[PDB]
Design a protein around this ligand. Structure first.
Ligand SMILES: [Cl-]
Length: 358
């Protein structure tokens, strides 16, 4: 509830910075994931660096209830109870021969039930592979090469990574016997021919206006388990750019969508998509106030090391999502549109993305 909203709202704001910077390119992101690893980060920071993170996220991780809330949240989401195909990894790596604050590790581990890993970034390629293998093996082998070539070097002292793979199955899946190349109309007027799925069913649907007055469709594709949903949304009119919608998104608005949904017999035309995005969190986080964490001597990580100056050399998220098959009105998404994977009991925005070109 409370912390699920803070986390989601925060993550949706990060998504927006990412979106406003790749205005015409495919993006998949995880609001929840970036909130999770920046909450971890809070434990390692101090002074103004810590205050920046806290002012942007809306809560302090060491307040009572805060951390236990987040763990209960994690167990609510990643519950093999749901037979869920979410695989997730968070991880902070720090240079090996720096004296860590006594008492930090046991504390970090009690709160998050994971640990900060120590490696030697002086073996540049060996350390890149240790981190990559760690991410790969902890995402069911789905997320490879998170750290690209030259992403780390001898001076690298602290690296933050977040990786997610999601392959849910729609409660009511699209029948393959109904997929066909259709004209998809891109943000720059030019069109292209992509395969679009289609299905006539009793879909949850509603429509909203932007603060500007532009109309848009929202539709909810529930997943097996009755717990997660994908929402698909796009301005009805093609001359209105998807950004008019992305710019007004929030975790609350998304809750209102769900709240207004009604079950209506509809024809849905929806392009298949396979997205894999690596997002460099630096610029987006910087745009939200968190600037110090990236500056060599101004960054305060004195909760992690009281003696040696640390700064974040890389903060990276890599996400992968595959959306495939497993007198009604028509909703045709032959334009750029948004998607959101939502955990409805808590209101957590797990995934969010835009398809500008499938
Ligand atoms: Cl557009």
């Amino acid at each position: 509830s409370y912390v699920a909203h803070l986390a989601s709202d925060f993550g949706v704001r990060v998504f927006q910075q990412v979106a406003q910077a790749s205005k015409d390119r495919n993006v998949v992101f995880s609001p929840y994931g970036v909130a999770s690893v920046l909450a971890m980060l809070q434990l390692t920071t101090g002074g103004e660096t810590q205050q920046q993170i806290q002012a942007a996220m809306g809560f302090k991780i060491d307040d009572k209830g805060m951390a236990p809330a987040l763990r209960h949240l994690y167990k609510e989401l990643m519950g093999p109870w749901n037979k869920d195909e979410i695989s997730t990894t968070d991880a902070i790596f720090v240079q090996r021969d720096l004296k860590l604050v006594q008492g930090f590790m046991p504390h970090f581990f009690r709160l998050f039930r994971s640990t900060v890993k120590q490696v030697d970034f002086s073996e540049v390629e060996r350390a890149r592979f240790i981190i990559n293998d760690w991410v790969k093996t902890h995402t069911k082998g789905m997320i490879s090469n998170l750290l690209g070539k030259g992403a780390v070097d001898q001076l690298t002292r602290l690296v933050l990574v977040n990786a997610l793979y999601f392959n849910g199955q729609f409660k009511t899946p699209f029948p393959d016997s109904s997929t066909h190349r259709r004209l998809f109309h891109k943000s720059d007027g030019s069109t292209v021919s992509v395969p679009m799925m289609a299905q006539t069913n009793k879909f949850n649907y509603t429509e909203f206006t932007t603060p500007d007055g532009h109309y848009y469709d929202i539709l909810e594709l529930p997943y097996h388990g009755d717990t997660l949903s994908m929402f698909i949304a796009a301005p009805y009119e093609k001359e209105v750019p998807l950004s008019a919608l992305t710019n007004i998104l929030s975790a609350q608005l998304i809750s209102h969508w769900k709240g207004n949904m009604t079950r209506l017999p509809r024809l849905l035309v929806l392009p298949k998509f396979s997205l894999e995005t690596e997002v460099d969190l630096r610029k987006p986080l910087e745009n939200l106030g968190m600037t110090d964490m990236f500056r060599q001597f101004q960054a305060d990580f004195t909760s992690l090391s009281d003696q040696e100056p640390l700064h974040v050399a890389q903060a990276l998220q890599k996400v992968k999502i595959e959306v495939n098959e497993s007198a009604p009105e028509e909703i045709i998404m032959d334009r750029p549109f948004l998607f959101v994977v939502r955990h409805n009991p808590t209101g957590t925005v797990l995934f969010m993305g835009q398809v500008m070109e499938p």
